[PDB]
RNA sequence: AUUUUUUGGCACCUGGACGGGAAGAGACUUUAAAGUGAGACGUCGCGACCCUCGCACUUGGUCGCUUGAUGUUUCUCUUCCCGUUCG
């Protein structure tokens, strides 16, 4: 498939609790296993029919090269986009208010594929690059930590003082 | 009396005034009989000099940006609705059409 | 088995609140999360997952069950039940 | 028990002086005597004298007090009544 | 004893001075009438805001709930 | 119940907004806000609510340590009447 | 603009879906595309659908004096002639409005 | 109407209030009237500014009420 | 984008409808409508208040560009007095019950 | 106002202006006007700075904001 | 339109830009040498020691934040490396 606006407008939207325990608060969009493939001609206009506000858009297993252009949202705290086929993350195209952002099994390959992670927004306080081939090489998580030194988790791990104080002295 | 007035101008263009100065304009769709009021397709604004005092007007732009409409980054802090329901003790003014023949709506 | 999976042997010592968001962003992956329910009051160190589908299910199992989760090798298995409180 | 209301008419029959807080003007109150009253607690008050008030430590100096004279005190802006 | 609305249908014709509520403004003029719900009109006002006039109005009519007190100017 | 109405605009208070009507003459209403509105009185009721003609709206802005007037010209209104202050007689 | 491009593909993808049509002409209400830009998108809509008089009543109520004429049109090619029968009896001229009344009760 | 009737069903639950001085209550709902009107007892009282304090009993009038926060299990109640 | 609603919708269309509600101090509360009053009062299921914190109203001055980190408290299930109600705004419909998505 | 419980009993009420009069409620109203007896103003912790007020004194129900019990 | 909701105690008061942080100034306490625009509420957390072995429908205690950020009351600015955007 690829993007067009019915797609996107009768996407399933219901309320979840994950980020509050007690009460059904998010508004999680599913676009899941949707096999989605990317296409600058079709996807950010059909973008423009995501319903607003919404606060959890999930693209799990989609075909899209690059982070979508999400840029306009000022409410989707939470971008999900495992399994796909993402090459580079340009931070630009990040939520303004991302707090979680998910890349595992992508197609990340070097630390040159991640270098303009550093103008990811700072509210980012999550990220997850496992199985990413980039998770492979040496120093990879200091590398990705001095590049945004502001995560409070990284692959699910904490990101502890010591390691931020590293990061922030380069 | 007057408010039955208001209840016939449904489908034509108002700005009504609130008390804490923000104007709505738009489409009147309903009065109740307490003068609340329902309006479609809405611009909030709020007049330019009052964005420099908020000591007065620091509440009347919390709820203008708070009423989620302010996406427009334009000055006098427009924000844009597609539907409102204004509670009638708020209501200052209401500036009406020009064009409204009032005598066969007040006869 | 089941929508629901149990998730054993978390850190103990994380916030929950951190614990439930990334319980959800990893098991997201491979499936879609309908709920994570999590009282350690009553049930220290675990939680259930209940997703939309037995096949996604069964892949989590398949995938996240031992990988590392702060540290601590997580313990994951069909539940007993469904969670009621969905 | 004694209503409000009947307490006022106790003010109103001893003719006895009271001093009247204002509602939101905690800088201020009246001094004197209730000549009568109605349902929504509007007093005529003779001899009235408005007193400056501190707003805390709220001592009360009479002697700089300002004579009204016979007033219609509007209900809606008392708070208190006391003898 | 005198009742707030015997009192002040007494006071119609006589000047009094109604002290607002509000601006420390008070209008001094002879009382015309005066509503049920305590609404005034005067005539003759004078606009007085912290004892200094802003000159003769002519006629007013006062909305009742703005008034703090009516008192009489002897 | 109705004819009080008709005795209370015609004897009691209103009856000088009830004049300016029926005369037609403009008005100066003074509202909670310190603006000012002269204008021209087609229909009120006991609220005072008011539908107006010809409303010239007045009031002064401040910038800095002055003040600078500034006004408006509306055709038509209706005024909430819980807003009015005074409304004067214009000689 | 590149919007209407996302719509066009959807149309290829499923032409009978007539809700995409609709969502469609709803993105052109609200940006708010000419009159004869729409009776375009309008007359596609119903040619895509010509076996079903539905879609022309959506278009009749759109185009509410081409309205008059399209509804001569429509009522040429019955229920919607009954639905015209209030307007058809203001024309004052008989032969024009009970003809085509006749003829509906013929197919009735 | 409902709003009223749902703050009689909150009777005997802790219910937490928020004043028009921004003041704060929380305490057992004991009494409610139709007018809002309420009676907390075992009450902890804050000021606007968050100094806390605790009182025995207090009754609240209604015109100064801002909202009530009432019990999650309400929800379920049949009034809706 | 955002939702449309019927122009015909009266309150008493919008319950089970995600409002935004807006009051005379300056602040929200978000949450659906369960019920409404003569007055609007109003029950507000598993409710949210924001308001706009006195650092963050002066980017809300004259220079999207903007962006107000307002300050939230999770209320849960609030009766609104109607006095402070100055406004209410339509942010979302009913949705489905997360519940409808379970396949078996 | 089933306010009979604090009849006779010491209360301290918290009423419009931030003001805090205590005493002894004699009785109350359909309005919440009441009636206290012994009543002092409250100003802050030192006596010195309370003060006795009159013999009778009436407060009018509109202006109690919350009446506590002592 | 008259105390408890809707007919008002409300109103006076080249270049631009943002953000990493460094150096000085400032201010207060020490005896030339060492510390960092005032005083105080609260709240999210973070991270260590102290509670529990696990399939349900509020884990608990305690200490540092020498900042990890944040909201709110009361009193009296120059300069250099540099990240990122705008026309």
């Given at each position: 498939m690829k993007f067009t606006p019915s797609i996107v407008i009768d996407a399933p939207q219901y309320y979840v609790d994950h980020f509050n325990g007690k009460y059904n608060v998010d508004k999680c969009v599913i676009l899941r296993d949707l096999q989605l493939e990317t296409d600058s001609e079709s996807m950010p206009s059909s973008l423009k029919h995501l319903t607003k506000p919404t606060h959890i858009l999930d693209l799990t297993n989609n075909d899209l090269i690059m982070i979508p252009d999400l840029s306009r949202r000022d409410d989707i705290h939470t971008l999900l986009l495992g399994?796909?086929?993402?090459?580079?993350?340009?931070?630009?195209?990040?939520?303004?208010?991302?707090?979680n952002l998910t890349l595992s099994n992508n197609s990340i390959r070097r630390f040159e594929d991640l270098q303009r992670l550093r103008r990811a927004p700072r509210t980012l306080k999550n990220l997850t690059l496992i199985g990413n081939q980039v998770c492979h090489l040496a120093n990879y998580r200091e590398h990705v930590l001095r590049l945004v030194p502001h995560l409070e988790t990284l692959d699910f791990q904490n990101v502890t003082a010591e390691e931020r104080k590293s990061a922030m002295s380069f | 009396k007057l408010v039955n007035f208001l209840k016939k101008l449904r489908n034509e263009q108002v700005t009504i005034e609130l008390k804490n100065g923000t104007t709505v304009w738009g489409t009147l769709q309903s009065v109740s009989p307490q003068m609340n009021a329902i309006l479609t397709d809405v611009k909030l604004t709020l007049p330019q000099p009052r964005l420099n005092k908020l000591n007065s007007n620091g509440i009347a732009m919390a709820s203008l940006y708070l009423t989620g409409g302010q996406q427009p980054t334009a000055s006098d802090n427009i924000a844009s609705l597609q539907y409102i329901n204004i509670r009638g003790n708020t209501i200052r003014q209401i500036i009406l059409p020009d064009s409204l023949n009032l005598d066969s709506l007040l006869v | 088995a089941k929508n629901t999976l149990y998730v054993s042997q978390l850190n103990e010592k994380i916030n929950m609140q951190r614990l439930r968001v990334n319980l959800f962003l990893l098991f997201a992956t491979f499936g879609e999360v309908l709920k994570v329910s999590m009282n350690f009051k009553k049930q220290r160190g675990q939680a259930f997952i209940t997703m939309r589908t037995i096949d996604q299910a069964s892949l989590a199992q398949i995938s996240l069950n031992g990988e590392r989760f702060f540290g601590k090798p997580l313990k994951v298995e069909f539940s007993k039940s469904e969670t009621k409180t969905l | 028990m004694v209503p409000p209301i009947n307490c006022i008419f106790n003010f109103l029959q001893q003719q006895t002086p009271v001093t009247i807080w204002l509602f939101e003007q905690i800088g201020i109150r009246i001094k004197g005597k209730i000549v009568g009253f109605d349902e929504f607690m509007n007093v005529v008050i003779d001899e009235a004298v408005e007193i400056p008030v501190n707003s805390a430590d709220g001592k009360e100096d009479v002697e700089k007090g300002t004579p009204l004279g016979k007033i219609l005190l509007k209900g809606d802006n008392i708070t208190l009544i006391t003898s | 004893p005198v009742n707030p609305k015997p009192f002040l249908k007494g006071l119609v014709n006589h000047r009094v001075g109604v002290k607002l509520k509000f601006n420390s403004t008070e209008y001094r003029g002879t009382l015309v009438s005066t509503d049920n719900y305590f609404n005034l009109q005067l005539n003759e006002a004078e606009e007085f805001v912290a004892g200094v006039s802003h000159g003769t109005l002519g006629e007013i009519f006062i909305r009742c709930?703005?008034?703090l007190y009516i008192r009489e100017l002897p | 119940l109705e004819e009080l109405e008709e005795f209370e605009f015609k004897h009691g208070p209103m009856s000088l907004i009830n004049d300016a009507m029926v005369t037609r003459t403009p008005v100066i209403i003074s509202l909670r806000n310190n603006h000012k509105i002269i204008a021209r009185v087609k229909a009120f009721d006991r609220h005072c609510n008011m539908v107006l003609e010809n409303v010239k709206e007045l009031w002064t802005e401040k910038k800095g340590k002055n003040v600078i007037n500034r006004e408006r010209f509306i055709s038509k209104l209706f005024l909430?009447?819980?807003?009015?202050?005074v409304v004067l007689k214009t000689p | 603009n590149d919007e209407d491009v996302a719509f066009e593909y959807e149309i290829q993808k499923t032409p009978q879906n007539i809700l995409t049509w609709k969502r469609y002409i709803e993105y052109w209400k609200e940006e708010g595309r000419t009159d004869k830009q729409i009776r375009w998108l309008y007359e596609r809509f119903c040619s895509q659908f010509v076996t079903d008089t539905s879609i022309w009543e959506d278009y009749i109520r759109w185009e509410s004096s081409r309205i008059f004429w399209l509804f001569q049109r429509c009522l040429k090619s019955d229920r919607i002639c009954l639905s015209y029968l209030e307007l058809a009896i203001e024309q004052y001229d008989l032969a024009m409005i009970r003809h085509a009344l006749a003829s509906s009760l013929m197919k009735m | 109407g409902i709003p009223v009737k749902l703050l009689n069903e909150a009777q005997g639950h802790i219910v937490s209030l928020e004043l028009t001085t921004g003041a704060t209550y929380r305490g057992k709902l004991v009494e409610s009237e139709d007018s809002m009107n309420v009676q907390l007892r075992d009450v902890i009282a804050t000021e606007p500014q968050g100094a806390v304090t605790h009182m025995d009993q207090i009754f609240v009038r209604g015109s100064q009420i801002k909202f009530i926060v009432v019990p999650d299990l309400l929800k379920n109640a049949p009034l809706f | 984008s955002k939702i449309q609603v019927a122009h015909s919708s009266r309150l008493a269309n919008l319950i089970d409808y995600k409002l935004r509600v807006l009051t005379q101090d300056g602040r929200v509360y978000i949450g659906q409508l369960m019920a409404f009053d003569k007055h609007m009062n109003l029950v507000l299921n598993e409710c949210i208040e924001e308001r706009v914190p006195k650092t963050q109203?002066?980017?809300?001055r004259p220079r999207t560009t903007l962006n107000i980190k307002v300050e939230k408290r999770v209320l849960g299930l609030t009766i609104l007095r109607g006095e402070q109600i100055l406004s209410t705004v339509v942010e979302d419909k009913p949705l489905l019950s997360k519940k409808e998505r379970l396949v078996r | 106002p089933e306010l009979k419980k604090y009849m006779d009993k010491k209360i301290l009420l918290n009423i419009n202006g931030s003001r805090k009069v205590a005493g002894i409620l004699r009785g109350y109203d359909i309005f919440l006007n009441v009636v206290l007896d012994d009543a002092m103003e409250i100003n802050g912790e030192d006596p010195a700075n309370n003060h006795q007020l009159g013999l009778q004194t009436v407060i009018r129900?509109?202006?109690?904001i919350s009446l506590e019990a002592l």
């Open positions: 399994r796909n086929n993402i090459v580079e993350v340009d931070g630009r195209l990040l939520p303004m208010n991302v707090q | - | - | - | 709930n703005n008034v | 909430r009447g819980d807003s009015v202050i | - | - | 109203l002066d980017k809300l | 129900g509109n202006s109690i």
